[PDB]
Amino acid sequence: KTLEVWIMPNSPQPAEDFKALVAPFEKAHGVEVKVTVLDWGVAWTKITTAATSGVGPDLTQLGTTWVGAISAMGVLEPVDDVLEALGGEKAYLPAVWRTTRLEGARQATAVPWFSELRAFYYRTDALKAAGVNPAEMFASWQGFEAGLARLKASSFRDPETKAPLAPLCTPGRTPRTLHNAAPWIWGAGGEIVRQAGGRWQSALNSPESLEGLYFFLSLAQKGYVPAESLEKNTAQIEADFQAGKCAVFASGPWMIQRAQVPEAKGGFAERTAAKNLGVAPYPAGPKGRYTFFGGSNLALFNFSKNKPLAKELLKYLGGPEAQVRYAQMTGMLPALRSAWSDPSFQQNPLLRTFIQAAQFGRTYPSLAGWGGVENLAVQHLGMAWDLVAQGRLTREALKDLMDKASAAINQALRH
């Protein structure tokens, strides 16, 4: 007997970790679980192709932000039974509970697998050499920019590269998602979409969203982010932080685990950045402190011929044993609230900072059109970043891009 599962690259050796995670299940049920790893860059397309075509695995990993869109296509098995067997609504953070379905849906269509939220990794050696107290830098927008100015003026040089560090690296090339931008939007008291009456509408062109976007994008126009870094994607900026080329950058808690794994095994433990590694929350904006909170769930296709066995595997993967183990393997946080209290997560000082930052975590709504909204947003924000790279992003040009972004988004949401 056989299950097929699709997962994204959650850990250094994604197939092998997942295989080791499900071995006791394989033993106890006399079944083989076959796993296929999809790059995040391709996963949306493969998962919607499976959904329209009726050809795919029994189970797929789904990003929390995708659950609504795939559910609304009507292709997922209800999983209220699994969620009840795992302790129902009470067993989850309300933000995690809301990702188990398309907003307004009767039935749950995804089981929470792991959670993830964003914070600033920083070079403790580079901040110390620049005279930056991280508690000041990461308290506020004003502290953040004062710190980047200090990092820019620093005479510090990385002991291996023998070169200066950029103060901040953020990608300006393939903005797949708004994850990087959202906290600046939210911090200014903006939103990506707003519900008024029944209807969702873009708020990317609200004065608040525009203040936050302009603040963020203009840091690179002020020289805190080098030219180089606006022609790079997320994976390259990650590599650049690891290679000792930036003082500060925004990512999720998986980097903590990668910092403890040798180069040889797909980590960066040998690098100066790994041995001089700090974590601070996003600074509080003028209307409050937010960070992107997400993660991945697991869903069962309703065209599967292995539904009961697939539900047994969902129970196992959402359950306390596997929740703690997979979080360890991947460096993500568990989706199951109880598993947060495992000492292995409380005792890592960097992870403790991610856990405290979860208080200000903020999710996207679980909308049916969410794929097209995010896709339309990043396409126009892309063009904003191209203005930055030529030193031509004005508040007015940004308003124009976001007005158009908003027309396009409102049009898709009317569908």
Ligand X SMILES: OC[C@@H]1O[C@@H](O[C@H]2[C@@H](O)[C@H](O)[C@@H](O[C@H]3[C@H](O)[C@@H](O)[C@@H](O)O[C@@H]3CO)O[C@@H]2CO)[C@H](O)[C@@H](O)[C@H]1O
The least distance separating ligand X from the CB of residue 60, rounded to whole angstroms, comes to: 13
Check if the beta carbon of residue 189 is closer than 8 Å to that of residue 286. yes
Which does residue 116 touch among ligand X, Cl ion, Na ion, none (CB within 5 to 8 A, set by kind)? Answer: ligand X
CA distance 359 to 379: 30
- Hey, what are 366's tokens? 């679980």
Number of C-beta neighbours around residue 329 at 10 A: 21
Closest distance to ligand X from the beta carbon of 122 (Å):
17
Q: Write the binding mask 16 to 35 for Cl ion: x where contact by CB under 5 A, - elsewhere.
A: x-------------------
Residue 16 or 321: which CB sits closer to Cl ion?
A: 16
Among 91, 117, 165, 192, binds Cl ion (CB under 5 A): 192
- Please list, in sequence order, all residues whose beta carbon lies within 8 angstroms of the beta carbon of residue 216, skipping any fewer than 6 positions away: 170, 180, 181, 184
Partners of 202 in the β-ladder: 193
Q: Which does 192 bind (CB under 5 to 8 A by kind): Cl ion, Na ion, ligand X, none?
A: Cl ion
Given Cl ion, Na ion, ligand X, none, residue 13, with its beta carbon under 5 to 8 Å by kind, binds: Cl ion
Q: How far is the CB of 250 from ligand X (least distance, A)?
A: 10
Judged by beta carbon, residue 191 or residue 312, the one nearer Cl ion is: 191
Q: Is 229 in the site for Na ion (CB under 5 A)?
A: no
Of 4-12, 109-117, 173-181, 329-337, the segment contacting Cl ion by CB under 5 A is 173-181
Alpha-carbon distance 354 to 304, whole Å? 37
Is the CB of 37 or the CB of 105 nearer to ligand X? 37
Secondary structure E strands in 138-267: 166-168, 193-196, 199-202, 246-251
**Nearest-approach distance from CB 258 to ligand X, in angstroms:** 7
| Residue keyed to tokens 């990668």 | 258
In whole angstroms, what is the distance from residue 397 CA to residue 278 CA?
A: 36
Residues binding ligand X (CB under 6 A): 9-10, 40, 63-66, 116, 177, 234-235, 238, 252, 254, 294-296
Q: What distance in Å separates the CA atoms of residue 32 and residue 5, rounded to the nearest whole number?
A: 11
CA angle 66–317–264, rounded 5-degree value: 85
User: Which member of 154, 234, 366, 406 binds Na ion (CB under 5 A)?
Assistant: 234
Q: Minimum CB separation from ligand X for residue 18, in Å? A: 12
